């Protein structure tokens, strides 16, 4: 696609940017800055660019029905590839640190970026803060004197802290809440009452429709400095909504696609994750079929996994996903009426998140 | 002290903040809210409060020479506070992560976060994240109004990204530049060339200067909305050649100093690290003294470790610390009397600043 090539061409110049100011600012060697060119390609390239191009789109449908110079579209499109990239190496970030934590091998078809042999956990953790910091410092090089500085700050912090919560909730879904202690080892979970559908959507709530949804649609909102001509509840409730959607797809192919097309190698129920797949399958199952579950969830070894795989499939679960769906359809359509009331054009992109989302196969 | 208490009490309230915040707006539950509390607690106390009581002398110099209110005086000492914690915070997640990437085992007297039973690497790293994230949040929150807001954040975040570039010189002080590549795994270097004062130089100015003096000195001054009664480039470089030193002080500790008294056990030998003394021993070292630094430098073999200890002790190396010091206090008092030009004030802050440093036994 196009759109995308020059998304990417604003990626280059901002890699340069910040490669150029280590050098002439932090006294950086040509291998450090190597390395960290290395870096920033392998944690911040070759995913879908979703939540980049979000933003991109959000102003392009401004742009569509709005006046302004030639310039004036030009500056706004450049900010919403800037914007779109600080959410890009948001995710980059989280993602470092989560492929450590969750202990994964592989991301977007390559060793995690932790497993690469001169990387390790020790450099991965350190890298994972650089790109983060990044966000902030191409913010202030490329938005100094944008009028929409502080409210994008300001909302950027915020999905950010909700982003690292929402990671505690879900490191921390397979200890017993009564239990957790930092002076005495988690034993995991022997009853699972905490996997519910309400505990699960608290989880991916602020773990991931923050900065997977919400930030990227108010974000392409600010650089159009069209965020007054919408209802931000509406905003809001479309992303949760779509953001927790987006998480259930993630954890049925953690489990059911294969490793080939989804880039990734899974590992929820090794790490016995509070997934959609272990809460709905505890939703459903009777007395025998929960033990067995119990035996078996969060151990590494493949034959224990095979057996909660072999449950998942038995418990006819793409059933529950097709009505959970067609639930979700009804919802996020009707939200997208809503945002037609004041927003038309804002309620089109929400239409096309919503499309490519529903749409997506890795 | 009376001053101390008065800042920990500001560090309760913002403590009751952010936690009552994380009730009414972020669904944590008492458990995981107790968690980090223990976190906070544990990570963010029981250090000397250096940089944090920095900021709030440098402002209580200011207050003492200037006109205002009582309300105002208590509002700019209640912001010097805000500050101080701010940067306590920053420290705090630059300890945690440090303490995982150094293999350390002690911090404060106590088991670094990581080491904590119920809380592990994995947990520790989020943690750490949370930490910084805090620092943001009591921002926008305490000082929303005030018109210091863009440059602290713009100078808070410059601070930042200056650290975790450090922590990368640091991490990789032992490796041959040449050599470093993602792809292929570190081999420790053998020759030590890169063991200068120049480069120990980079890296200490870079991971120490930035967070441990120029921010707490410019935060006091940005809450006195006194920065343009300063020499911002003597305020620099004051700035780096007491933090320069402070770091030095670090590195002899490491390994001189009983971690009885420390509050932390050392690893810099062990590490292999860049330090003060290896770079100090390398300087005067004789051709057969540098062939066993060689030998036994960067191996957790204590009979290794050992070794290295004793090449120390027999260099002398306390003879060079006394000309290292007798220098920086010579360059110190010239920038203080030099600082004295534009704000004498600002000058004697500084003034006892190096002195509590230069005291310093932890
Ligand atoms: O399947 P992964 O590992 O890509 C995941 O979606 C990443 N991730 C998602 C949300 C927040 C986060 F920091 C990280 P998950 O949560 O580990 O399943
Ligand atoms: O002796 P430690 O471990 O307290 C140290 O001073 C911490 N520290 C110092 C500077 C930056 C940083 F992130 C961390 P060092 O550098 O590991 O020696
Ligand atoms: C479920 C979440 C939020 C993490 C995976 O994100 P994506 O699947 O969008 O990652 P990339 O395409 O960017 O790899
Ligand atoms: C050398 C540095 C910068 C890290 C240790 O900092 P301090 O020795 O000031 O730490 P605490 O008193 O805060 O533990
Ligand atoms: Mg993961
Ligand atoms: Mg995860
Ligand atoms: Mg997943
Ligand atoms: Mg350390
Ligand atoms: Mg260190
Ligand atoms: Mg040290």
New binding site residues.
């Given amino acids: 696609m196009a759109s995308m090539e020059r998304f990417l061409s604003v990626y280059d110049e901002v890699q340069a940017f910040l490669l150029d100011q280590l050098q002439s600012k932090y006294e950086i060697d040509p291998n450090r800055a190597r390395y960290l060119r290395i870096m920033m390609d392998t944690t911040c390239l070759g995913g879908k660019y979703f939540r980049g191009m979000t933003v991109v789109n959000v102003a392009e449908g401004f742009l569509a029905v709005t006046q302004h110079d030639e310039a004036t579209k030009e500056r706004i499109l450049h900010d919403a590839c800037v914007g779109g990239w600080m959410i890009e190496f948001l995710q980059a970030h989280?993602?470092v640190?989560?492929?450590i934590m969750?202990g994964?091998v592989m991301?977007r078809g390559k060793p995690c970026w932790y497993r690469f042999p001169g990387v390790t956990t020790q450099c991965a953790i350190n890298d994972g803060i650089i790109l983060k910091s990044w966000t902030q410092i191409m913010a202030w090089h490329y938005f100094a004197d944008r009028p929409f500085l502080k409210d994008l700050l300001c909302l950027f912090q915020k999905v950010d802290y909700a982003?690292a919560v929402?990671?505690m909730y879900?490191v921390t879904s397979m200890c017993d809440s009564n239990k957790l202690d930092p002076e005495v080892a988690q034993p995991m979970t022997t009853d699972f009452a905490e996997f519910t559908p309400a505990i699960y959507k608290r989880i991916v709530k602020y773990?991931?429709t923050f900065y997977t949804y919400l930030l990227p649609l108010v974000m392409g909102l600010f650089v159009s400095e069209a965020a007054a001509s919408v209802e931000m509840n509406l905003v809001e409730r479309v992303a949760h909504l779509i953001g927790e959607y987006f998480?259930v797809q993630?954890?049925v192919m953690?489990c059911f696609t294969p490793p080939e097309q989804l880039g990734?190698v899974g590992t929820?129920i090794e790490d016995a994750?509070c997934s959609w797949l272990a809460v709905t399958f505890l939703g459903k199952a009777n007395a025998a079929q929960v033990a067995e579950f119990k035996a078996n969830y969060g151990d590494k070894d493949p034959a224990k996994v095979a057996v909660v795989k072999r449950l998942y499939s038995e418990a006819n679960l793409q059933a529950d996903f097709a009505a959970y769906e067609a639930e979700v359809v009804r919802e996020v359509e009707s939200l997208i009426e809503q945002l037609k009331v004041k927003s038309p054009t804002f309620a089109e992109s929400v239409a096309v998140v919503w499309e490519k989302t529903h749409k997506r196969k890795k």
Same sequence: chains 1, 2.
């Fill in positions: 989280y993602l640190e989560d492929d969750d994964s991301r982003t929402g990671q879900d773990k991931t998480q993630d954890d953690d990734k929820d994750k």
